[PDB]
């Protein structure tokens, strides 16, 4: 846990971004 600002990205982020794009 070096970076205080490090978070996670997964398949669900992808799908929400693609939905957000299509709309």
């Amino acid at each position: 846990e070096l970076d205080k600002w490090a978070s996670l990205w997964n398949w669900f982020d992808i799908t929400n971004w693609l939905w957000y794009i299509r709309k």
Epitope: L8, F12, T15, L18, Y20, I21, R22
Partner: antibody, heavy 132, light 110 residues
Framework: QVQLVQSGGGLVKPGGSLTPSCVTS????????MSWVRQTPGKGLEWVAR??????????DYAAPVKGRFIISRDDSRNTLFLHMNNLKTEDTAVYYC???????????????????????WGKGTTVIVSS | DIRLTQSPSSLSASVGDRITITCRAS??????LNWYKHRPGEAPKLLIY???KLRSGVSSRFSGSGYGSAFTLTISSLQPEDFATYYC???????????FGQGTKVDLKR
């Protein structure tokens, strides 16, 4: 090495409670959706519940036969998935599997946003016997 | 409210055989279909996701085909470890239900 280490479950009276658990290693637990699936005697595989990352809500869904009696929860700092079983019934007797789930995004444009949800890794199961 | 029908319920096979099992959905589910294996005494395991995508680590002897309502799982050359029960599973419902088929048990022919 990916492992889903499950509790021993055990034996409970109808109306009682139990909390099978699943402690994971080998992958980033906090980035992973999780489910419980059960196998009742004689019958086949039956999905029970799923939970997302804590940051997604969490989003939680339950199968109709357990809605209102079971609670799925997670503790990321310990890599632990729980299934809190309350008001247990003889129909709940089964082997309960924890699973690490994934979603396959649909890349066909008009289905952008939809995904195929599947159980990517499974534990060996915990037996729960509900009997008077 | 989607239904899955697997056939045959029981398949007699020998070591080295080409094996085919089928899953019929009550309606078009496109490619929202996955295949699992379960041997007694082992954790279930994913074989195929999205109708035809092979899971990493699973042998190339497994392959899935189909789009809509008629899906197939094929084992090109049956090995002893393949004697097991195989399930299909759909993920197409709006309210998640994730129905599994009843399973096809593959056993040793005599």
């Amino acid at each position: 090495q990916v492992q889903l280490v499950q509790s021993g479950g055990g034996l409970v009276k109808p109306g009682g409670s139990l909390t099978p658990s699943c402690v994971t290693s080998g992958f980033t637990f906090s980035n992973t959706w999780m489910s419980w699936v059960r196998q009742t005697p004689g019958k086949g595989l039956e999905w029970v519940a799923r939970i997302s990352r804590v940051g997604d809500g969490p989003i939680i869904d339950y199968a109709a036969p357990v809605k209102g009696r079971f609670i799925i929860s997670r503790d990321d700092s310990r890599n632990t998935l729980f299934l809190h079983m309350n008001n247990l019934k003889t129909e709940d007797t089964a082997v309960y599997y924890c699973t690490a789930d994934e979603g396959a995004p649909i890349l066909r444009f008009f289905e952008w946003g939809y995904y195929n949800y599947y159980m990517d890794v499974w534990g060996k199961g915990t037996t729960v016997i509900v009997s008077s | 409210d989607i239904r899955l029908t697997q056939s045959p319920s029981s398949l007699s096979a020998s070591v080295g055989d080409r094996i085919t099992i089928t899953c019929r959905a009550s309606q078009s589910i496109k490619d929202y279909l996955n295949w699992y294996k379960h041997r007694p005494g082992e954790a279930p395991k994913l074989l195929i996701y999205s109708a035809s995508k092979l899971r990493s680590g699973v042998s190339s002897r497994f392959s899935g085909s189909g789009y809509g309502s008629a899906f197939t799982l094929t084992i090109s050359s049956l090995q002893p470890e393949d004697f097991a029960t195989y399930y299909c599973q759909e993920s197409y419902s709006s309210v998640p239900m994730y129905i599994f088929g009843q399973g096809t048990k593959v056993d040793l022919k005599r």
